[PDB]
Structure 1
Amino acid sequence: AVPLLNKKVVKKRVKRFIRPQSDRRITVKESWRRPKGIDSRVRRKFKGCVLMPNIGYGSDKKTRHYLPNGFKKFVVHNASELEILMMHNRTYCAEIAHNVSTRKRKEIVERAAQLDVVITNKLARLH
């Protein structure tokens, strides 16, 4: 399958937004939280501090949610759901759900080859 997308993917930021002071404290997890403190230097945006996520970092709408291979991901749980991508094989690639058995993955992989549907994790748990 030849991906239909042609515009290059431009990531405004590749680094993640780490919660302030999550390094210092184990109990403070890395998932982002907006600091609400009155004196918070991160909230007040002093230079040399952690950056906060804002809408300006929004990626181009034409290249949004596109994987590096040039397709968009759709999660499939069986052979029937794989057939939904027959007419979108140049736009959407399938990914077998994490909890599908190895026996049923063989059917999905075989069917995807017939339909020319890209499978992102086709080598999963076959050894």
Structure 2
Amino acid sequence: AVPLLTKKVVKKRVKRFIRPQSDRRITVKESWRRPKGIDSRVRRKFKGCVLMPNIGYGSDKKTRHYLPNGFKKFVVHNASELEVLMMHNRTYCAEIAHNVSTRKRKEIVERAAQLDVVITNKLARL
């Protein structure tokens, strides 16, 4: 399948937005939280400190959510759900759900090969 996307994928930032002091205290997880402290230097945006996410980092709408291969992801749990992409094989790729058994994975892979649908994880459980 030849992807329909033509514009190059541009990422404004590829680093994660790690929570401040999650490196310091084990009990503080990495998942982003906006500081609310009155004196927080991160909240005040002191230079040389942890950066806060904002809408300015937003990805271009034309290339948003596109995988590096040039397609968009769609999770399929069985071969029946695979036929939904029959008319969208140039824009959408299928990823088999993590809980599908190998037996059903083989059938899904065969059907997709018949339908010219890209599978991102076709080698799983083989």
TM-score by length of 1: 0.99
Q: Deviations over 1:1-50 (max 9, x none)?
A: 00000000000000000000000000000000000000000000000000
Q: Distance in 1 between matches of 2:74 and 2:110?
A: 17
Q: Give the count of matched residue pairs.
A: 126
Partner residue, 2:124: 124
Unmatched runs of 5 consecutive residues or more in structure 1: none
Partner residue, 1:64: 64
What's the offset of the Cα at 1:83?
A: 0.3
Q: Distance in 2 between matches of 1:16 and 1:53?
A: 9
* 3-state DSSP of counterpart to 1:87: coil
**Structure 1 residue ranges, 4+ long, deviating more than 2 angstroms after superposition:** none
Unmatched runs of 5 consecutive residues or more in structure 2: none
RMSD: 0.2
Partner residue, 1:95: 95
What's the offset of the Cα at 1:62?
A: 0.2
Q: Deviations over 1:55-79 (max 9, x none)?
A: 0000000000000000000000000
TM-score by length of 2: 1.00
Q: Distance in 2 between matches of 1:24 and 1:2?
A: 47
* 3-state DSSP of counterpart to 1:42: helix
Q: Distance in 2 between matches of 1:82 and 1:29?
A: 37
Q: Distance in 2 between matches of 1:16 and 1:71?
A: 23
* 3-state DSSP of counterpart to 2:118: coil
Q: Distance in 1 between matches of 2:81 and 2:4?
A: 22
Q: Distance in 2 between matches of 1:125 and 1:43?
A: 46
